[PDB]
């Protein structure tokens, strides 16, 4: 069992036009996610916003109350929504206890509550990506599935964007105080994707994302890889063109 | 007819990393190719390729000897890969005469000889996309079609980049000194098309996008074309484009 976390200072546009490929990389990408029996965090000043992964290998995994939290429990003012993209997993928080497997998510709202990751099996370890943020109230907890989502067909074959956008922790579905997230799922042969993190699976490993970034008139890009996330300004694009099909999820909060 | 013609200076791979969006689109983009009665060139100090375009509507467009070239033909120590990439025209140069509809390519060798366009129907034009570089002796003329052409099939569905490459004016289908050229067609719902290298698009509706990268490996920008646009691709650069729709390009290399 090891937390690591790090803090990351948000930016003004007209800075962030400058920027070289080694600083994009360094400021908005998330690299290292998955490590076992490890839970790695990024803390964003942009909305506070905390996005991590979880990969219990053969050891239950505590969500650590990391010092920029200033709080007993992760979750004392917070709240979050989880989504397993590796094997049969289970998250307890206090007493409550949930299943999932892959693709399915789950919402889990304030409280003092110790929150635990583990995989059923160490050989098909569990991958447990989350987003989250400051909540003033207590909303209940929700497993997700695809089968309560709100699902939105989009592009074409001619586009290569065909895909389909699996709406699930949002307000449609369930209460929660800013957070929301989804899944969305390209259609084989297509690629395009036409503050907000996003993270990118379900690719091979010799492929990659194109993920774009900055201005209208004045874009950037950075290069990215499975089981990776990015940063997303609010002042910033947030297209991706990969070389191979994909899924990805995506989370927001703020107004 | 107007000929018109800009000189673009090469670059360090150290000061390119510097550029923002403005600069890449002044050096490397070539936006303005095809406009009715000019021959618009770009006359470029990576390996002296000169690219232009040239729309002849009504009238018959002759290819100047530009400044640059210090000469008193185009040709006289140059070579040069044309496609028509529009409706059927004529080439000629000296006495002898091409036909060429889309999609059919003509190597023109080195030799003092006027060389001008024309389109059958002004009503549909011809749009003659051309690449040139120095040539030190004269090979024979010679019109490339697709039905000539060294074809190879190349990409899948999978990775949005199932391509036929029809390597037209290259050394297994004809002699050139330096210059070869080749026309890639990418399938319905491909996007990915894939020295110094020039590459220009087009069969891609006008409502769509192609970009394409540029820069070192670890350290790449992109700059976003359109339709019957070209790019200069220098060769410390990667040179992969992804658009929004799948597309037709040409490319035309040179140098060692």
């Given at each position: 069992?090891?937390?690591?976390?790090?803090?990351?200072?948000?930016?003004?546009?007209?800075?962030?036009?400058?920027?070289?490929?080694?600083?994009?990389?360094?400021?908005?990408?998330?690299?290292?996610?998955?490590?076992?029996?490890?839970?790695?965090?990024v803390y964003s000043m942009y909305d506070r916003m905390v996005v991590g992964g979880a990969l219990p290998v053969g050891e239950v995994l505590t969500l650590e109350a990391i010092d920029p939290l200033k709080?007993?429990?992760?979750?004392?003012?917070?709240?979050?929504?989880?989504?397993?993209?590796?094997?049969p997993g289970i998250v307890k928080a206090?007493?409550?206890?949930?299943?999932?497997?892959?693709?399915?998510?789950?919402?889990l709202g304030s409280g003092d509550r110790v929150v635990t990751f583990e995989?059923?099996?160490?050989?098909?370890?569990a991958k447990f990506y989350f987003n989250s943020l400051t909540a003033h109230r207590n909303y209940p907890d929700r497993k997700v599935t695809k089968a309560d989502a709100v699902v939105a067909e989009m592009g074409s074959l001619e586009g290569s964007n065909h895909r389909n956008i699996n709406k699930m922790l949002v307000?449609?579905?369930?209460?929660?105080?800013?957070?929301q997230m989804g899944m969305?799922?390209?259609?084989?042969?297509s690629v395009w994707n036409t503050m907000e993190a996003y993270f990118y699976f379900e690719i091979p490993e010799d492929h990659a994302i194109c993920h774009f970034m900055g201005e209208v008139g004045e874009t950037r890009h950075v290069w990215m890889k499975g089981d990776q996330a990015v940063l997303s300004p609010e002042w910033?694009?947030?297209?991706?063109?990969?070389?191979?099909?994909?899924?990805?999820?995506?989370?927001?909060?703020?107004e």
């Open positions: 069992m090891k937390t690591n976390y790090e803090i990351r200072y948000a930016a003004h546009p007209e800075d962030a036009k400058s920027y070289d490929t080694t600083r994009i990389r360094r400021d908005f990408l998330i690299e290292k996610i998955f490590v076992p029996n490890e839970v790695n965090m709080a007993p429990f992760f979750l004392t003012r917070r709240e979050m929504g989880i989504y397993n993209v590796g094997g206090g007493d409550a206890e949930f299943e999932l497997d892959y693709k399915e998510a789950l919402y995989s059923k099996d160490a050989a098909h370890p307000n449609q579905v369930l209460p929660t105080c800013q957070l969305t799922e390209l259609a084989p042969g910033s694009i947030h297209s991706a063109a990969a070389t191979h099909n994909y899924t990805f999820i995506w989370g927001m909060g703020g």
